[PDB]
C-alpha cells in the first residue's frame, strides 16, 4: 500500500500537560534511546513504500515511532506518563509483530527496549 498519514503530534482540542514524569520521559528516557546507535530505524514512521513492505500497514494498524513520541513530548501532547509509555510499548510490539526473531531490526528493538525498561523502572515521583 501507500503509507498512511503519520500519527498526529498535536491536537488543538486535546488538553496538554507537563508533569515530572513526562519531563523525565523526554529528557532522560527518549534522550537516551534517541542517541543510541540502534535508534535510527525507529526515529520516524515506518516508510513501507521505501522499504518495499506491501503488507506492513495491513498487519500494523497502530503504527508508532520515536520521532512521533519526541514531537508529542515537545508539544506537551500527552496528559500523563502512561500515554507516553504506551506509545513506546506500541512501537516495540509492532516491531515484534511484523518482523521475525533474529532479524536485525528485532535485535535492535530488543536492545532499545531493555534500556527503556531500566529507565522506566527508574521513573521519578509523580509530583
Amino acid at each position: 500500500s501507500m503509507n498512511p498519514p503519520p500519527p498526529e503530534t498535536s491536537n488543538p482540542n486535546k488538553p496538554k500537560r507537563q508533569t515530572n514524569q513526562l519531563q523525565y520521559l523526554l529528557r532522560v528516557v527518549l534522550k537516551t534511546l534517541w542517541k543510541h546507535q540502534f535508534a535510527w530505524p525507529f526515529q520516524q514512521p515506518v516508510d513501507a513504500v521505501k522499504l518495499n513492505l506491501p503488507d506492513y500497514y495491513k498487519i500494523i494498524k497502530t503504527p508508532m515511532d520515536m520521532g512521533t513520541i519526541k514531537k508529542r513530548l515537545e508539544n506537551n501532547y500527552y496528559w500523563n506518563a502512561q500515554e507516553c509509555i504506551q506509545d513506546f510499548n506500541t512501537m516495540f510490539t509492532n516491531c515484534y509483530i511484523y518482523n521475525k526473531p533474529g532479524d536485525d531490526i528485532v535485535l535492535m528493538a530488543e536492545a532499545l527496549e531493555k534500556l527503556f525498561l531500566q529507565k522506566i523502572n527508574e521513573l521519578p515521583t509523580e509530583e
Binding site: 540502534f38 530505524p41 522499504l51 513492505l53 511484523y98 518482523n99 521475525k100 533474529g102 532479524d103 536485525d104 531490526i105 528485532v106 535485535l107 535492535m108
Partner: peptide, 8 residues
C-alpha cells in the same frame, strides 16, 4: 529479514 540488514 523483511527489512534486511541494519547492524554495521
Amino acid at each position: 529479514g523483511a527489512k534486511g540488514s541494519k547492524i554495521n
